[PDB]
């Protein structure tokens, strides 16, 4: 009748007595050190709003952008380890262009998300291909685009699995943002009020002042390519909120 | 099969159906594969452009290219011409278009004419003597003004203000050499190109600041 | 040791506003001898596209099997059936994959497009392709193209034309078969019937 | 502490490489080496460790090696690793000569060897070399030169330095007895004798305890020679007479 | 605990080995970089001077190409490998594209090379951080920073190494459009920034100045003393 | 019988200073009938021994031999230096014979050698 | 107390001749949701229960497609399920290409077991933490197979896996004698009634949390989701 | 674990002596700062000020009920404290690896009608070096003679020691552990011998047993450790005891509230299907 | 006592023992009992097969394999290792037949598989197998033959064998048979009777008898016993139990 010490959370290939992989859980917990990102999917388009942290007035804001352009009709949002997301965005772009070259058409958001997720699955087996990575990625992504089925929004998890969400929030204040989203989202809504609600939630959750310089916004609409808001547009939409 | 998996080098001996010096080993894997891309090793009628004439020159307001399709629209801002093997031209220029799009996505800035021509020459130079046959003129406009280059399958890559390849190359080249002028208006340039291509024996393109257009 | 053998055949394709027609003969031969008098050269790929190939027979069989495997792969990966233009582009890439040791096969693809109109594509043993309104291939293409050029139509008149073209071409060719097969692609599906020759 | 000493690929909580520090500490037991730069030559003096009565003298020298027609080196540390490093240096010099039809510059040779030394402190499973080097030579770009290398993979050019046992006292005395731009070969030899005498507290100096090498340029050619016991005895006698006259 | 292997996550999601590697940067000599309109200035302070040494072989400012420079702070032996690889890549890029290399491109290459060594337990990261300045093909000055973890991002004026917080605060307070009006003003600004930590200027400071369409130029003690005197006036 | 031995043009869709002076056409075919035979002698000999041993005794023998080879060939020097290959030669049976690979073109005195980190990365499979 | 030394790897035997990591990996199957699979004289049916992260997210899919006559259901991890599905699809495709015949389910499941046994013996690997239910049709009729993380497979007539599947197993055992005569209707109903025993007594089955997969004598493998499930749910009773 | 071929490795120790056997001012300052980072603070949320006196020293107590884990706090919220007026008195603030902020909370309530009845809903995790501080700041130094304590918690079924297999047990089930001075009898079988319980409920029982205070601990061994309806319904038999007889009034409305809150669960990571 | 020297297959105890192999051999005694008896003109096998649930088919997870046209096999221990070893034996027999053009002798096959099993108890990158098995065959020019292989890699010829949980009682029961002068028809009943006697019903709910022989009756082929003979043997065993 003694109490002793047991350890199971120091290896990628170790099972807890209840069948739990703890390194993957820790990698998922690593996301909560990033910045909050919000994505709202609507029948008129997709909205992506993220908060950017500025460590000094001497930096260039246009160099730490957290919203990139995968293709002419697909966006992306990032949270977690920055260095890891750059090896996934490149894979997404390369896969999209390879598919276009082979089939003379454009991929779907689900296909792009699956292609990216096929790379995050492989880890822990260094005896395989030498380029394989020995630990899970520490970054979560939100995909937003328009295709034959209409506007779409997807979410991908360091575990290598993806689902489709009508409205998702990731980052440090994810739980509070999700709780606020659940009380305001309804299907029959417009892009303008989606933008307004996302901005309101961002203002509520941030620890700084929302002054149209510490946030960025982007939308995609049927018939128009991926578009990122400029300073004047941000000021106009941030006025009277 | 765990001891054989540790040795990270799959030999035919370790596989199944092995007897003698060979066996039922080369007759086992007969599937259609999963995913890759690669040309086959060396060991009918091949369509080739013979009776085609092309023309291209650059001036102050842009680049004008005419021909008798026979012009490949690589990009909204890049143009190309085929001469020789149609399949080779189409394939390699599709690869060039993909590379240009990758560059633009990565660097958030359009590629230049010199870089594109160098990339095409580098791709086609690896297979020297294998049997490829293509001749291309590449037109565009970038931060340094209009550009014009000539690339073929022999590794040649040159730049000039006036080029012509085809059956009636000599006559058209002489005509547009007689009538050439750098400080030329768009209408006079159109007239000169039309007259040269007429004397060579009709399409017509015009590259500007913000992409090419079709005249006729 | 020549790894190439020529086998006779003749294929045709007519594109309409809301239909597509692909027809071929049914003979396999090696110049002098007759292998079989019943061997159609038209294969159905999906519910809206048909491919017809002629030339060396083993290459034709391998090409058809590879095409079907790739179609299944695409359907599994993308959760939808792939269209005619995608098939044409994929076939062009497959053909150019063997530039230095080519397939000795001539292909013609016919079917419907996204908007619901006829589409016809013609290839070369290396991979160059383009969209056309009507195309003739096979051994007797040279002596059959001018007739079509000197002669869109409705379904019945196009069928009448196809029948007369093959009946005229068979009597003057040494590789045409004893039967003619026609595949009709429309919005309600695909149907086919055999006409004795 | 004792938690971050297992291997070379572990960073201490304040960013320190304890294995490399211990490897550098291993050099403090070997013999003492000196190097002095003069206006018309360069000098290299070393202390003999093999002094047993039953040993033999078969080789050209014990610690001085020749790498090239224009360079030489001295080692301090583990003999086994020093031999490998010397062979590699000779091979590198010959490779450059074959490539360019010209003798290799001293800084290029030093950098090429230091890259190899640094490569063993990054990939786990290996052990860093516990050797330090002193290089002298002549070059058409900068003339006479003197360099130094350590197990970490670092190097730098000096005018007068010292490695091995009791290095700190020798460096301290050199820093106050060396005058820049006014040193000749005789003055350098006298200074080297005095510094060796002070830093060797074992006993009085004898000609069989030290070896001295001299590199000079004579009629478009570089000559490297090792001074003999006669010259060493004369130098020691002159230094002793000077000290006696001092009091 | 959780701070002995490179590829092991802390229970709160921390990779401690990379942070420990970054801790080694904070002990090197201070480096300062300021971007002007027609000039870029790099400044490194000498940690200590030994009278019996050759200053030519201990320089911390290097040239990667005709239009790119570099200054580092961290492990000296580790910096040399990265510098040589960057030089080879800069020369190899021109062989594929006729245009000269770009500052963002070379920073990306360096960052990827640094990141390649933080992916396995069989090798340790590089304990250095770098400042890269230069001019683009069309003539736009740039300035970037790189970290051992493999991240890069642009700046207007930055300082790395030990005692960098005070220098960064001074630059934030004293940076403006009327202070970078001319080359002399920019050089004096860099000298003033470095003087906050250096105990005595002129002897413990080295500057490298690059102008547009010109090669790197290293100022000498005479010029440094002249600028120090003008500032002190 | 040990000396008698019995579509890889990838397109980058999966540095030119490092590699040069090579074309596919020249390397399509060997220059001498004895080139590939001499380049791959040891591999062919090992394959022949494995084949005969597997046919006569069973699967265990070639597997054990390969396991011993792999285990003993992991304690060598880094690739930019020359190794001795003592235990591998003892296991392989070449500890009392001299061939033409030993007296011609001593690998320990080669005229070319690349950068250390580059070779270590290439061996690991990263490049 | 004495087990701490012998339960950190799959290459170590415990002093009682047990491999503890295999038993630990077998517990990951019970982390999923319930799945039920049964068969009749003509058809084979798979029924699965779907969960959702929140009201604004789509339910995760459990039933996948392998070939025109084979389908699988998943309970356990996700990456392992994806890898196994890819392997199954590749093997079926290769067999069809080479022999112009469908690949028998027995041979396919034997290949699965042979592949899965390897990572439980060598160092630097971990066992697959996923359990599958396979339904197919070939010359021998319908088939239902079950796979285990310990590289063990069984040939069943009705099986249930997942979290709290004991009730479903009890119901299937009680009603086993009537399965071989039912047509597609009342067979899907037996499956749904068996799956309903894994839920709390207050809540019921809606159309947004059930998936159905059917393969038969002349009917290929099809998946019914969302509004396609209503015809099967029309005739159910009020949870007696 | 070995990082390269042939590395020398040491076996782990289950007594924990391999770390503390190794026993500059900067190190001492770092240790002091780290110790200050994870101290326990009890404060009143009304004015954000700390209570300089132990919570039970300010207010007399006659009954104390503690719930640990999501299921226990859900059961108490749905069944007990839905039929009265309860005032919040104080809250605790903690920091450690597994509880970054304070879903994580520890709030104390006392009944308005009867100020001698208390409650505690702890959903966070208290580390092994913060439990004694918790006991000191909640109970104090001198306890009270007349006071009864009830504790509820949940444990996974794989932690149960039995001769048969773990999966063969009919989970969930209840077990009890009571001190010597607890005169009443539990409604579930007492815990078997080779099984032990540790962490915070063990700390509370040890305190009560040493200082002669009646107490009882209820355990639920379940196969689903998330928020589940079966697990919280397994606690129903406790309502028949004297500790909770006078606090439950309406069962159907509590069931309705439980169903309503079951539909607003937290988003689970999509690792398992 | 071998604590501290029992974490790898390449470590020697201070008295010269390898303990991982001993633990692997201990692991075999966790499964049911299988017996095999060699007689005048054949070999007959018998396995006590436990039932897990009624939801499984009749032929699920069998324990009698067909290695070749003339060789049978019975296993005990971990099942996955048993499947792997059966695959290995099939491959060996096929390779020999392909090389030399006639049926492989039983002794050679036993030697090959035993050496393959032994190869796993030498390295630290793998672990020893956890199953034992027996092989049986018959031919006109050689006669009946029976062998056993254990996880350590040791093979021997037997007149009657038993592996599993209750090998001791089974061996005691076998040692009272004059198997040298009887026939397969008279050995099937004895095998069934021994299996029924050994079985314990308190700790095991139910079981199904599994039988198969090879010999002159089957003309040198390994086959499953016909159902009627199984029923007769079971009835005789049940009667003899009373």
CATH number where D39 lies: 3.60.20.10
Number of D to H CB contacts under 8 A, please give it: 13
In Å, what resolution does this model reach?
2.9
Q: Any idea how long chain A is?
A: 241
Tokens of I149: 């292989």
Question: What span, in angstroms and rounded, lies between the C-alpha atoms of B203 and B71?
Answer: 9
Cβ separation of H14 and A6 shorter than 8 Å? Answer: yes
Number of G to H CB contacts under 8 A, please give it: 45
Chain C segment 74-93 residues within 8 A of G by beta carbon are: 76
Cβ separation of F47 and B36 shorter than 8 Å? Answer: no
Show Cβ contacts of residue G222 under 8 Å, excluding neighbours closer than 6 positions: G213, G214, G215
Q: Where are the beta strands (DSSP E) in C74-145?
A: 105-112, 118-122, 130-132, 134-136
Question: What backbone phi and psi angles, to 5 degrees, belong to E87?
Answer: -60, -45
Nearest CA-CA partner of A36 in A70, A75, A83, A79: A79
Nearest CA-CA partner of I138 in I46, I213, I238: I213
Nearest CA-CA partner of A32 in E5, H263, H124, H98: H98
B17 inside 8 A of chain F by CB: no
Question: What span, in angstroms and rounded, lies between the C-alpha atoms of B37 and B94?
Answer: 15
To the nearest whole Å, the CA of D118 is away from the closest chain F CA by 10
DSSP D180: T
Question: Which residues of chain G have a CB within 8 Å of the CB of C72?
Answer: 93
The beta-carbon neighbor of D119 closest among F111, F112, F117 is F117
To the nearest whole Å, the CA of F26 is away from the closest chain A CA by 30
To the nearest whole Å, the CA of G66 is away from the closest chain C CA by 8
Question: Which residues of chain C have a CB within 8 Å of the CB of B46?
Answer: 124-126
Cβ separation of F59 and I88 shorter than 8 Å? Answer: yes
Q: Tell me whether residue G232 is exposed, middle or buried, using C-beta atoms within 10 angstroms of its C-beta: 0 to 12, 13 to 18, 19 or more.
A: buried
Relative to beta strand E206-211, strand E157-160 is unpaired
Question: What span, in angstroms and rounded, lies between the C-alpha atoms of D186 and H32?
Answer: 62
C187 inside 8 A of chain G by CB: no
Sign of CA dihedral C129, C134, C137, C141: negative
Question: Which residues of chain H have a CB within 8 Å of the CB of A10?
Answer: 1
Q: Which domain holds residue E27?
A: 1-233
Question: What span, in angstroms and rounded, lies between the C-alpha atoms of I191 and I187?
Answer: 6
Count of domains observed in chain E = 1
Cβ separation of I56 and G14 shorter than 8 Å? Answer: no
Chains that touch E (3 or more CB pairs under 8 A): A, B, D, F, H
Question: Which residues of chain H have a CB within 8 Å of the CB of F74?
Answer: 5
Relative to beta strand E39-44, strand E206-211 is antiparallel
For G58, other C-beta atoms within 10 Å of its C-beta total 14
Bridge partners of D224, per DSSP, are D215
Determine whether domain C1-197 maps to CATH 3.60.20.10. yes
Cβ separation of H14 and A4 shorter than 8 Å? Answer: yes
Bridge partners of I210, per DSSP, are I47
Among the residues of A104-225, which ranges form H helices?
A: 109-120, 174-182, 191-205
Question: Which residues of chain I have a CB within 8 Å of the CB of B18?
Answer: 95
For A61, other C-beta atoms within 10 Å of its C-beta total 13
SS3 A150: strand
Question: What span, in angstroms and rounded, lies between the C-alpha atoms of B78 and B88?
Answer: 18
Question: What span, in angstroms and rounded, lies between the C-alpha atoms of H168 and H173?
Answer: 13
The beta-carbon neighbor of D157 closest among E4, E24, E54 is E54
- What are the distances in angstroms from CA D43 to CA C78, D36, D64, D192, H148? 77, 5, 12, 9, 91
To the nearest whole Å, the CA of D147 is away from the closest chain E CA by 10
Cβ separation of E10 and H3 shorter than 8 Å? Answer: no
**Is residue B87 marked as binding?**
no
Number of A to H CB contacts under 8 A, please give it: 37
Residue in the block written with tokens 């149609």: B86
Relative to beta strand B22-23, strand B18-19 is antiparallel
Q: In what order do the strands lie in the sheet with E31-35?
A: E157-160, E31-35, E39-44, E206-211, E216-218
Question: What span, in angstroms and rounded, lies between the C-alpha atoms of F87 and H253?
Answer: 81
Cβ separation of H97 and E10 shorter than 8 Å? Answer: yes
Question: What span, in angstroms and rounded, lies between the C-alpha atoms of E186 and E179?
Answer: 7
Question: Which residues of chain A have a CB within 8 Å of the CB of C121?
Answer: none
Most I CBs within 10 A among F50, F52, F57, F58, hence the mutation to make, goes to F58
Nearest CA-CA partner of E193 in E211, E208, E173: E173
Counting other chains too, the contacts that G194-199 makes at CB distance below 8 Å and 24 or more residues apart are G194/G36, G194/G38, G194/G47, G194/G160, G194/G168, G195/G34, G195/G36, G195/G47, G195/G49, G195/G160, G195/G168, G196/G239, G197/G167, G197/G168, G197/G170, G197/G171, G198/G34, G198/G49, G198/G162, G198/G163, G198/G164, G198/G165, G198/G167, G198/G168
Nearest chain C alpha carbon to A107: C78
Instruction: Count helices and strands (H / E) in chain A.
Output: 6, 10
Touch of A by I (3+ CB pairs closer than 8 Å): no
Question: Which residues of chain A have a CB within 8 Å of the CB of E149?
Answer: 83
The beta-carbon neighbor of E96 closest among B107, B118, B143 is B118
To the nearest whole Å, the CA of A83 is away from the closest chain E CA by 6
The beta-carbon neighbor of A11 closest among H1, H14, H103 is H1
Question: Which residues of chain B have a CB within 8 Å of the CB of F66?
Answer: 7, 9, 11
First to last CA, chain A: 63
Question: What span, in angstroms and rounded, lies between the C-alpha atoms of I148 and I34?
Answer: 12
Nearest CA-CA partner of H200 in H105, H110, H103, H133: H133
Question: What backbone phi and psi angles, to 5 degrees, belong to G192?
Answer: -65, -40
Q: Is B52 a catalytic residue?
A: yes
- Chain D contact residues (CB < 8 Å to H): 1-3, 7, 9, 124-125
Residue in the block written with tokens 């583990």: D78
Nearest CA-CA partner of B57 in B197, B193, B166: B193
Question: What span, in angstroms and rounded, lies between the C-alpha atoms of E148 and E151?
Answer: 8
Q: Which domain holds residue D64?
A: 1-247
Sign of CA dihedral A10, A16, A21, A25: negative
DSSP B158-178: EE-SEEEEETTHHHHHHHHHH
The beta-carbon neighbor of A163 closest among G28, G29, G53 is G53
Nearest CA-CA partner of E71 in E21, E134, E115: E134
Question: What span, in angstroms and rounded, lies between the C-alpha atoms of G45 and G144?
Answer: 9
Most D CBs within 10 A among F106, F111, F116, hence the mutation to make, goes to F116
SS3 A209: coil
Count of domains observed in chain D = 1
Residue in the block written with tokens 């260095």: A83
Question: What span, in angstroms and rounded, lies between the C-alpha atoms of C6 and C11?
Answer: 15
Q: Which domain holds residue I93?
A: 1-240
CATH number of the domain at I184, please: 3.60.20.10
Question: What span, in angstroms and rounded, lies between the C-alpha atoms of F91 and F46?
Answer: 12
Tokens of C15: 């594109």
First to last CA, chain E: 57
H-helix or E-strand containing B125? Answer: helix B113-125
Question: Which residues of chain A have a CB within 8 Å of the CB of B105?
Answer: 69, 93
To the nearest whole Å, the CA of B6 is away from the closest chain G CA by 7
Cβ separation of C76 and G89 shorter than 8 Å? Answer: yes
Nearest chain F alpha carbon to I115: F60
Rounded to 10 deg, the angle between the C57-78 and G79-99 helix axes is: 160
D93 neighbors D104 (Cβ within 8 angstroms): yes
Percent helix, percent strand, percent coil in chain B, to nearest 5: 30, 30, 40
């Amino acid at each position: 009748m003694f109490l002793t010490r047991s350890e199971y959370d120091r290896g990628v290939n170790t099972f807890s007595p209840e069948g739990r992989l703890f390194q993957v859980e820790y990698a998922i917990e690593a996301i909560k050190l990033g910045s909050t990102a919000i994505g709202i999917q609507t029948s008129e388009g997709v909205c992506l709003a993220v908060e950017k942290r500025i460590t000094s007035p001497l930096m260039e804001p246009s160099s730490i952008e957290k919203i990139v352009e995968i293709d002419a009709h697909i966006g992306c949002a990032m949270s977690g380890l920055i260095a890891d997301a750059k090896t996934l965005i490149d894979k997404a772009r390369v896969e999209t262009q390879n598919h276009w070259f082979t089939y003379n058409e454009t991929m779907t958001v689900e296909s792009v998300t699956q292609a990216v997720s096929n790379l995050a699955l492989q880890f822990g087996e260094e005896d395989a291909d030498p380029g394989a990575m020995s630990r899970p990625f520490g970054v979560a992504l939100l995909f937003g685009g328009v295709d034959e089925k209409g506007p779409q929004l997807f979410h991908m998890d360091p575990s290598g699995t993806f689902v489709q969400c009508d409205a998702r929030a990731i980052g440090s204040a994810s739980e509070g943002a999700q709780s606020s989203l659940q009380e305001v989202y309804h299907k029959s809504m417009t892009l303008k009020e989606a933008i307004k609600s996302s901005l309101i939630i961002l203002k509520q959750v941030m620890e700084e002042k929302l002054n149209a310089t510490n946030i960025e916004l982007a939308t995609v609409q049927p018939g128009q390519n991926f578009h990122m808001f400029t300073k004047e547009e941000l000021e106009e939409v941030i006025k009277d909120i | 099969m765990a001891l054989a998996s540790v040795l990270e080098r799959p030999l035919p001996v370790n596989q199944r159906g092995f007897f003698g010096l060979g066996g039922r080993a080369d007759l086992l894997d007969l599937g259609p594969g999963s995913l890759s891309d690669g040309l086959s090793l060396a060991a009918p009628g091949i369509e080739m452009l013979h009776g085609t004439t092309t023309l291209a020159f650059k001036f102050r307001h842009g680049v004008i290219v005419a021909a008798d399709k026979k012009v490949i629209e690589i990009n909204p801002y890049l143009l190309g011409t085929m001469a020789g093997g149609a399949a080779d031209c189409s394939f390699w220029e599709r690869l060039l278009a993909r590379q240009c799009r990758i560059y633009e996505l990565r660097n958030k800035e359009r590629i230049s004419v010199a870089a594109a021509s160098k990339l095409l020459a580098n791709m086609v130079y690896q297979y020297k003597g294998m049997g490829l046959s293509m001749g291309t003129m590449i037109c565009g406009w970038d931060k340094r003004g209009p550009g014009l280059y000539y690339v073929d399958s022999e590794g040649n890559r040159i730049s000039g203000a006036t080029f012509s390849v085809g059956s009636g190359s000599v006559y058209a080249y002489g005509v547009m050499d007689r009538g050439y002028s750098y400080d030329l208006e768009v209408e006079q340039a159109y007239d000169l190109a039309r007259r040269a291509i007429y004397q060579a024996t009709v399409n017509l393109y015009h590259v500007r600041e913000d992409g090419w257009i079709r005249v006729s | 040791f020549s790894p190439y053998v020529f086998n006779g055949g003749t294929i045709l394709a007519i594109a309409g506003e809301d239909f597509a027609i692909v027809a071929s003969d049914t003979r396999l031969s090696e110049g002098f001898s007759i292998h079989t008098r019943d061997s159609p050269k038209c294969y159905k790929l999906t519910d809206k596209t048909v491919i017809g190939c002629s030339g060396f027979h083993g290459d034709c069989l391998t090409l058809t099997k590879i095409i079907e495997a790739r179609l299944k792969m695409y359907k599994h990966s993308n959760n939808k059936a792939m269209t005619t233009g995608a098939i044409a582009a994929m076939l062009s890439t497959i053909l150019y994959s063997r530039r230095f040791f080519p397939y000795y096969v001539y292909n013609i693809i016919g079917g419907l497009d996204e908007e619901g109109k006829g589409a016809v594509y013609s290839f070369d043993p290396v991979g160059s392709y383009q969209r056309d309104s009507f195309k003739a291939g096979g051994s007797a293409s040279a002596m059959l193209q001018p007739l079509l050029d000197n002669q869109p139509l409705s379904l019945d008149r196009a069928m009448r034309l196809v029948k007369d073209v093959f009946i005229s071409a068979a009597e003057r060719d040494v590789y045409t078969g004893d039967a003619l097969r026609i595949c009709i692609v429309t919005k309600e599906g695909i149907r086919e019937e055999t006409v004795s020759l | 502490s004792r938690r971050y000493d297992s291997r070379t690929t572990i960073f201490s909580p304040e960013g320190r490489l304890y294995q490399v520090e211990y490897a550098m500490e291993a050099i403090g037991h070997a013999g003492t080496c000196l190097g002095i730069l003069a206006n018309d030559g360069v000098l290299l003096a070393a202390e003999r460790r093999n002094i047993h009565k039953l040993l033999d003298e078969v080789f050209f020298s014990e610690k001085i090696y020749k790498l090239n027609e224009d360079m030489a080196c001295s080692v301090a540390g583990i003999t086994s690793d020093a031999n490998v490093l010397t062979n590699e240096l000779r091979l590198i010099a010959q490779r450059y000569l074959l490539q360019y039809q010209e003798p290799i510059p001293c800084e290029q040779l030093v950098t090429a060897l230091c890259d190899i030394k640094q490569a063993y402190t990054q990939f786990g499973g290996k052990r860093p070399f516990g050797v330090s080097l002193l290089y002298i030579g002549w070059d058409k770009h900068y003339g006479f030169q003197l360099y130094q290398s350590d197990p970490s993979g670092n190097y730098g050019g000096w005018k007068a330095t010292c490695i091995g046992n009791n290095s700190a006292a020798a460096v301290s005395m050199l820093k106050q007895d060396y005058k820049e731009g006014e040193m000749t070969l005789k003055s350098a030899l006298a200074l080297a004798i005095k510094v060796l005498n002070k830093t060797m507290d074992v006993s009085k100096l004898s000609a069989e305890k030290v070896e001295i090498a001299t590199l000079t340029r004579e009629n478009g050619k570089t000559v490297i020679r090792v001074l003999k016991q006669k010259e060493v005895e004369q130098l020691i006698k002159k230094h002793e007479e000077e000290e006696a006259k001092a009091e | 605990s959780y701070d002995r292997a490179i590829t092991v996550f802390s229970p709160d999601g921390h990779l401690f080995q990379v942070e420990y590697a970054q801790e080694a940067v904070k002990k090197g000599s201070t480096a300062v970089g300021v971007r002007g309109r027609d000039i870029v200035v790099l400044g490194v302070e000498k940690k200590s001077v030994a009278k019996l040494q050759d200053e030519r072989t201990v320089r911390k400012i290097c040239a990667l190409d005709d239009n790119v420079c570099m200054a580092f702070a961290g492990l000296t032996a580790d910096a040399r490998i990265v510098i040589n690889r960057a030089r080879v890549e800069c020369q190899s890029h021109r062989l594929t594209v006729e245009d000269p290399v770009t500052v963002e491109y070379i920073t990306r290459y360096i960052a990827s090379l640094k990141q390649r060594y933080t992916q396995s337990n069989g090798r340790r990261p590089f304990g250095i951080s770098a400042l890269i300045v230069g001019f683009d093909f069309d003539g736009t000055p740039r300035l970037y920073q790189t970290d051992p973890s493999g991240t890069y991002h642009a700046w207007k004026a930055n300082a790395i190494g030990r005692g960098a917080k005070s220098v960064r605060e001074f630059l934030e307070k004293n940076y403006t459009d009327e202070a970078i009006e001319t080359d002399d003003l920019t050089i004096k600004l860099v000298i003033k920034a470095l003087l906050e930590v250096v105990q005595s200027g002129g002897k413990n400071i080295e500057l490298a100045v690059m102008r547009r369409d010109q090669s790197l130029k290293i100022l000498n003690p005479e010029e440094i003393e002249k600028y120090v005197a003008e500032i002190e006036k | 019988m040990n000396a008698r031995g019995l579509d890889s043009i990838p397109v980058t869709e999966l540095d030119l200073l490092r590699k040069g002076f090579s074309c596919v056409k020249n390397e399509l075919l060997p220059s001498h009938p004895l080139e590939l035979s001499e380049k791959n002698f040891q591999l062919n000999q090992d394959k022949m021994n494995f084949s005969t041993l597997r046919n006569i005794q069973g699967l265990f023998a070639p597997l054990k031999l390969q396991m011993e080879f792999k285990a003993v060939q992991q304690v060598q020097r880094l690739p930019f230096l020359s190794s001795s290959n003592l235990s591998l030669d003892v296991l392989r049976g070449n500890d009392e014979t001299i061939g033409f690979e030993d007296i011609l073109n001593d690998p320990s005195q080669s005229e070319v050698m690349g950068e250390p980190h580059l070779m270590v990365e290439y061996k690991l499979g990263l490049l | 107390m004495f087990r701490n030394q012998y339960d950190n790897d799959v290459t170590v035997w415990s002093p009682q001749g047990r491999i503890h990591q295999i038993e630990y990996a077998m517990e990951a199957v019970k982390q999923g949701s319930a799945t039920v699979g049964l068969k009749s004289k003509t058809h084979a049916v798979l029924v699965a229960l779907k969960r959702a992260q929140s009201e604004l997210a789509a339910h995760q899919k459990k039933i996948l497609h392998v070939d025109n006559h084979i389908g699988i259901s998943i309970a356990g991890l996700t990456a392992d399920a994806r890898l196994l599905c890819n392997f199954m699809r590749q093997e079926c495709l290769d067999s069809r290409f080479v022999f112009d015949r469908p690949l028998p389910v027995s041979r396919l499941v034997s290949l699965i077991g042979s592949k899965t046994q390897i990572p439980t013996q060598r160092y630097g690997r971990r066992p697959y933490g996923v359990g599958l239910l396979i339904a197919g049709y070939d010359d021998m009729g319908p088939h239902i197979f079950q796979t285990c993380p310990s590289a063990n497979y069984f040939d069943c007539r009705a099986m249930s896996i997942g979290a709290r599947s004991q009730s479903a197993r009890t119901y299937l055992e009680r009603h086993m004698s009537e399965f071989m005569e039912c047509n597609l209707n009342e067979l899907v109903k037996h499956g749904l009634r068996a799956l309903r025993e894994t839920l709390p007594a207050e809540q019921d089955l809606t159309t947004k949390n059930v998936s159905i997969g059917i393969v038969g004598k002349d009917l290929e493998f099809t998946i019914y989701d969302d509004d396609d499930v209503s015809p099967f749910l029309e005739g159910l009773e009020e949870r007696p | 674990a070995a990082t390269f071929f042939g590395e020398v490795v040491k076996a782990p120790c289950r007594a924990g002596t391999e770390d503390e056997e190794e026993e500059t001012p900067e190190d001492r300052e770092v240790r002091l700062q780290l110790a200050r980072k994870r101290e326990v603070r009890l404060l009143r949320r009304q004015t954000k000020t700390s209570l300089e006196v132990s919570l039970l020293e300010k207010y007399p107590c006659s009954k104390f009920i503690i719930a640990i884990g999501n299921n226990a706090v859900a059961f108490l919220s749905s069944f007990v404290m839905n039929s009265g007026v309860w005032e919040e008195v104080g809250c605790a603030k903690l920091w450690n690896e597994w509880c970054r902020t304070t879903e994580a909370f520890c709030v104390f309530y006392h009944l308005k009608s009867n100020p001698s009845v208390f409650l505690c809903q702890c959903s966070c995790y208290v580390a092994e070096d913060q439990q004694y501080q918790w006991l000191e700041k909640v109970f104090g130094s001198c306890p009270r003679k007349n006071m009864q304590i009830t504790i509820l918690t949940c444990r996974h079924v794989t932690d149960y020691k039995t001769s048969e297999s773990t999966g063969s047990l009919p989970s969930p089930f209840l077990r009890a552990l009571k001190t010597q001075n607890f005169k009443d009898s539990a409604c579930c079988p007492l815990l078997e011998q080779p099984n032990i319980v540790h962490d915070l409920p063990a700390a509370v029982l040890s305190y009560c047993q040493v200082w002669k205070i009646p107490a009882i601990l209820y355990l639920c061994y379940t196969d689903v450790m998330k928020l589940d309806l079966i697990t919280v319904e397994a606690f129903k038999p406790i309502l028949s005891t004297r500790s909770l007889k006078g606090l439950v009034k309406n069962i159907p409305q509590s069931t309705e509230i439980l169903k309503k809150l079951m539909t607003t669960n937290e988003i689970q990571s999509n690792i398992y299907t | 006592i071998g604590t501290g020297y029992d974490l790898s297959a390449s470590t020697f105890s201070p008295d010269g023992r390898v303990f991982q192999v001993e633990y692997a051999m201990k692991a075999v005694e966790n499964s049911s009992t299988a017996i095999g008896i060699r007689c005048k003109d054949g070999v007959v096998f018998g396995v006590e097969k436990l039932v897990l649930s009624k939801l499984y088919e009749e032929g699920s997870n069998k324990r009698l394999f067909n290695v070749d046209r003339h060789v049978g096999m019975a296993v005990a221990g971990l099942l996955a290792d048993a499947r792997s070893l059966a695959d290995i034996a099939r491959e060996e027999a096929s390779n020999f037949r392909s090389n030399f053009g006639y049926n492989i002798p039983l002794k050679h096959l036993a030697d090959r598989v035993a050496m393959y099993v032994h190869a796993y108890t030498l390295y630290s990158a793998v672990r020893p197998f956890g199953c034992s098995f027996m092989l049986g065959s018959y031919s006109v020019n050689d006669g009946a033959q029976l062998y056993m292989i254990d996880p350590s890699g040791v093979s021997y010829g037997y007149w009657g064998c038993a592996i599993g949980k209750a090998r001791q009682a089974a061996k005691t029961e076998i040692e009272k048979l004059q198997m040298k002068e009887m026939t397969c028809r008279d050995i099937v009943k004895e095998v069934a009777k021994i299996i029924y006697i050994v079985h314990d019903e308190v700790k095991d709910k139910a079981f199904e008898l599994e039988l198969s022989w090879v010999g002159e009756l089957t003309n040198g082929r390994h086959e499953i016993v016909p159902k009627d003979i199984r029923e007769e043997a079971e009835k005789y065993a049940k009667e003899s139990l009373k």
